[PDB]
Amino acid sequence: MSKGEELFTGVVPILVELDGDVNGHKFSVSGEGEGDATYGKLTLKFICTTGKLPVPWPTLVTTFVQCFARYPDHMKQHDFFKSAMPEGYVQERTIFFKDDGNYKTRAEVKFEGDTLVNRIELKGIDFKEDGNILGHKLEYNYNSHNVYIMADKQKNGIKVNFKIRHNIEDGSVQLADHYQQNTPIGDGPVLLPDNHYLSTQSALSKDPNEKRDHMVLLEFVTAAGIKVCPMCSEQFPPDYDQQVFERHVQTHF
Amino acid sequence: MSKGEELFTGVVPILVELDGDVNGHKFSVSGEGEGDATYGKLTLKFICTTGKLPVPWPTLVTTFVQCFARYPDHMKQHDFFKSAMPEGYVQERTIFFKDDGNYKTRAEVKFEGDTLVNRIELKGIDFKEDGNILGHKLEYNYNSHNVYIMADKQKNGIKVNFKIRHNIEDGSVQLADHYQQNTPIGDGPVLLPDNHYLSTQSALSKDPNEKRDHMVLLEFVTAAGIKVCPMCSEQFPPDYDQQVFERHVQTHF
Ligand SMILES: [Zn+2]
Ligand SMILES: [Zn+2]
């Protein structure tokens, strides 16, 4: 459905660079790994190159290449992200931490040679030095979420929203409301989609031989949101021939 | 801290067999992959060898080898699972699905030759044909949970409990309360731990090539629950030198 699409048919190398400033605490993070959009799979490891991260690693999970989403055959028309490639897209976000500060981010994602590269600037303000973020009170894990996408034809792109729950130690949760826009860098045609979502799931781990402050991130990302026997609830592929299916339903009578 | 411990030093291949019966619906699943206790990493793929699974895959996540948990060095005394290897342990569970039925499971985990093998029998009763489980209303994802472990000296074993949240489509959650016991199979000495937890995280995926009904499972499991500048909340290793640490604290004066 786009020239972009064809660029993701194999494993693609990824590089990430973030510059951050949260409540004046400056830091930088570099990441590398690879992505496999046929599977919907990101494999990344990030390292804080300025020392220790002044925020919990899990608050940067969302910031740390949605072009690696698996879009099934029947929805490839709705894949804005690859359709912008190679010239790429800019991702903007504001992220509001309930009862705390906010991050604003701007990312440039595009191919640099054969590598997909995300260069990000992040600013955080109004955080509580004793709150869950600057206080490092967040657990080192993550939950599944759905990323809701819609077209923003006015800006030739998409608008995206979702809410993240970050588990806290005492068993509380810290809410992070994400408001996102993506616009193409280049001026070729892009794919503008019907409303749908990315099911995303995230596993965070540690490289037992890495002494630097670091996060290993696995992500699995599959698009959805664009078949069941009414008698016995048996499940069939959504492509499953309609008359074969009804023949199964008739079996109940 | 045990001989078992040394068996988990490398990548270990894993096989899984389950025989299941839920509300009279019988089924079998076979699984394989590998485990790396040094990272706390399980990699598994499962196939329903009888046809279609009459329950959702995510309801079998907890059932589908806790001997692969990474126990930090300072806690290797509390690692019951490896300590019962190679002879192994039996894991029993009752799993209560709120407003629905329950699974009861019994599993044998041990080495067979060089492979770690888990053979499981599962029985489910009192399920609603219309409810979240037999109606296949559960989303295909997973959240992080902490697995609370305690010694059960009377049984020369451990007792474990945790509560799983399964996301539903409409944004509801289905609760699954797990009550677990593990007892060694052999009669060598085992390690009986102080209370602690395993932080577990799971990512569920599909193999695009595989047309059988199946689940790809990644897990990252690390033990905890057995050091922070009181001024700026800067983080230090739990074993970081106490005088170096206080030297940093004194920096603020
Ligand atoms: Zn039927
Ligand atoms: Zn300090």
Curated annotation (Swiss-Prot), chains A, B:
GO biological process, one term: generation of precursor metabolites and energy
Matches recorded under InterPro entries: GFP, GFP-related, Green_fluorescent_prot
Effect listed in the UniProt record for changing N195S: In EBFP1.2; shifts the excitation and emission spectra to shorter wavelengths and increases quantum yields compared to BFP
Cross-referenced SUPFAM superfamilies: GFP-like (SSF54511)
Domain of life: Eukaryota
Keyword Iron in record: no
Effect after changing I164V: In P9; increases fluorescence at 475 nm excitation. In R10-3; matures to the red-emitting state with excitation and emission maxima at 555 and 585 nm, respectively
Effect of I168V: In EBFP1.2; shifts the excitation and emission spectra to shorter wavelengths and increases quantum yields compared to BFP
Consequence recorded when altering S30R: In mut1.28; shifts fluorescence lifetime from 3.03 to 2.76 ns. In mut2.2; shifts fluorescence lifetime from 3.03 to 1.94 ns. In mut3.3; shifts fluorescence lifetime from 3.03 to 1.88 ns
A Pfam family it matches: GFP
UniProt tissue specificity: Photocytes.
Biotechnology: Green fluorescent protein has been engineered to produce a vast number of variously colored mutants, fusion proteins, and biosensors. Further generation of mutants led to more stable proteins (at 37 degrees Celsius for example) with brighter fluorescence and longer fluorescence lifetimes.
Effect of T200 to H/W/F: Results in significantly red-shifted excitation and emission maxima
Keyword terms, alphabetized: Chromophore, Luminescence, Photoprotein
Post-translational modification: Contains a chromophore consisting of modified amino acid residues. Maturation of the chromophore requires nothing other than molecular oxygen.
Effect of N146K: Increases fluorescence at warmer temperatures such as 37 degrees Celsius. In Esmerald; leads to brighter fluorescence. In VisGreen; leads to brighter fluorescence
Keyword Transferase attached: no
Impact when changing I168L: In R10-3; matures to the red-emitting state with excitation and emission maxima at 555 and 585 nm, respectively
Effect noted on mutating V190A: In mut1.5; shifts fluorescence lifetime from 3.03 to 2.72 ns
Subunit structure, as described in the record: Monomer.
Protein purpose: Energy-transfer acceptor. Its role is to transduce the blue chemiluminescence of the protein aequorin into green fluorescent light by energy transfer. Fluoresces in vivo upon receiving energy from the Ca(2+)-activated photoprotein aequorin.
Family as reported in the entry's similarity comment: Belongs to the GFP family.
Name of the molecule in the record: Green fluorescent protein
Species per Swiss-Prot/TrEMBL record: Aequorea victoria (Water jellyfish)
Gene designation: GFP
